[PDB]
Amino acid sequence: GLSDGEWQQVLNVWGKVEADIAGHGQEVLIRLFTGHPETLEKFDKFKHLKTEAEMKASEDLKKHGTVVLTALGGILKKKGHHEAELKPLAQSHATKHKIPIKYLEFISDAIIHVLHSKHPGDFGADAQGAMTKALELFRNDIAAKYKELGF
Prior knowledge:
This is Myoglobin. It comes from Equus caballus (Horse). It is found in: Cytoplasm, Sarcoplasm. By secondary structure, the protein is mainly alpha-helical. Helices cover about 75% and strands about 0% of the residues.
């Protein structure tokens, strides 16, 4: 788990995201899709996108970025008490969307990248440690549910 101090850093960082949820969501997804094109193949509504310009021009991509980061924000604000929030996502992502757990590592990495890209010099080493721990805890708890489902 995270300490109280670590959670405070996580949620302070998250304030940056909340100020521009759509632009952070868009940049995270673009980073994911560009760095790991296999991920793009799991979205029927995005698998048409060949270029970053197309992705950049897609209002539905930005829309989905808002949905994804809203969901993660809700999870993070539970500070680890997130079973109810995480369970349905684990089940839809393992059973319906068929998303390998590695893709959650890819998006975690993309989030850390985008935060430094958008806030260079303002995402300190303590803050990155805390946000990393939070994203690891999320992954770990998703992973436990994936194992239950054999995915």
